[PDB]
Design a protein around this ligand. Structure first.
Ligand SMILES: O=C1CN(c2ccccc2)c2nc(Nc3cc(F)c(O)c(F)c3)ncc2N1
Ligand SMILES: [Cl-]
Ligand SMILES: [Cl-]
Length: 317
């Protein structure tokens, strides 16, 4: 069922006007209202789902609470970042069509996801690429965590490049994000009945596998698994993904003995030491503990020095 008439002008709750274009989720290209058609270079998209769709409501609340353009810009200035890979929220509203009620949200438009590029590079990223990606993901995670949310699902298909700058990566999809610390009150170590999602099996946290709500350590552990996947093309448990008990078992045992994970994943005597140090630091976090993000970034920065590079912001894709 078509939600829009292509080229129609829609007006958000702030009375800002937008024009709808072709699909690019039900997601269409969008631009500011003008006499021009919405082109394939549109700077925004519009996401539209039925008003009872739970994930779009969750996502919209995240973007309204944490991704207001000026809120992001203030953080960038105060923390002296080059950029922050949290997509900007440009507006939202309600759209009725043919007796059905929809919700819409206007967001930044992006270029390619990282999964497409990874697969086009025969399922490897370089050590430089992985460290540069991970430093920027650590900035993103620190930001969302400080604004009471965890992503719980970091992976290359949720990492998009800036449409006009292939050195800037953004983390998307907050439909199943989780508000772990509402009003500064950390959730307890237990399932949340209101949350059904377990993440993506090959990358998800041990916490998620144990049926508890995701927290900050879980996001950092997910990134850990991504790093190994990216560096090596593989994870140890990838042939057993239909059995969650198996996946959890392997992650638990590998966490208890990170040296064995390094031996499994990398050629003998040739493991990148910053990855092990990263995993060891994450292993020391309690369920409610605030990560020392700057120490984690320092660990990755020590890896760039080790390979004769520096954090120059180049993703080398
Ligand atoms: O080919 C595509 C499909 N696609 C996509 C990729 C991965 C996942 C979802 C959509 C795109 N999404 C976006 N924007 C976007 C998506 C979000 F999900 C979000 O939260 C947000 F703020 C912004 N721009 C261009 C895209 N090109
Ligand atoms: Cl803020
Ligand atoms: Cl391979």
């Amino acid at each position: 069922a078509e939600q829009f008439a292509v080229g129609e002008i829609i007006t958000d709750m702030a009375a800002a006007a937008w024009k709808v274009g072709l699909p690019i989720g039900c997601i269409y290209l969008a631009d500011m209202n003008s006499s021009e058609s919405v082109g394939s270079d549109a700077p925004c998209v519009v996401k539209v789902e039925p008003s009872d769709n739970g994930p779009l409501f969750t996502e919209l609340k995240f973007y309204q609470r944490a991704a207001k353009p000026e809120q992001i810009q203030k953080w960038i200035r105060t923390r002296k970042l080059k950029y922050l890979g949290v997509p900007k929220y440009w507006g939202s509203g309600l759209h009725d069509k043919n007796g059905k009620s929809y919700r819409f949200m206007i967001m930044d438009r992006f270029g390619s996801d990282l999964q497409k590029i990874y697969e086009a590079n025969a399922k490897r990223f370089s050590r430089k690429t992985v460290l540069q990606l991970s430093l920027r993901i650590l900035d993103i995670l620190e930001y969302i965590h400080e604004h009471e949310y965890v992503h719980g699902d970091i992976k290359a298909s949720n990492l998009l490049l800036n449409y006009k700058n292939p050195d800037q990566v953004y983390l998307v999809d907050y439909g199943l994000a989780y508000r772990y610390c509402p009003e500064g009150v950390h959730k307890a170590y237990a399932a949340d009945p209101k949350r059904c999602h377990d993440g993506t099996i090959e990358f998800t946290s041990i916490d998620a596998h144990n049926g508890v709500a995701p927290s900050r350590r879980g996001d950092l552990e997910i990134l850990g698994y991504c790093m190994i996947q990216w560096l090596t093309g593989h994870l140890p448990w990838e042939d057993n993904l239909k059995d969650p008990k198996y996946v959890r078992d392997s992650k638990i045992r590998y966490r208890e003995n990170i040296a064995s994970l390094m031996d499994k994943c990398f050629p003998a005597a040739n493991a990148p030491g910053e990855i092990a140090k990263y995993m060891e630091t994450v292993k020391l976090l309690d369920y409610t503990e605030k990560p020392l993000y700057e120490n984690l970034r320092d660990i990755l920065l020590q890896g760039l020095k080790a390979i004769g590079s520096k954090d120059d912001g180049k993703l080398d894709l």
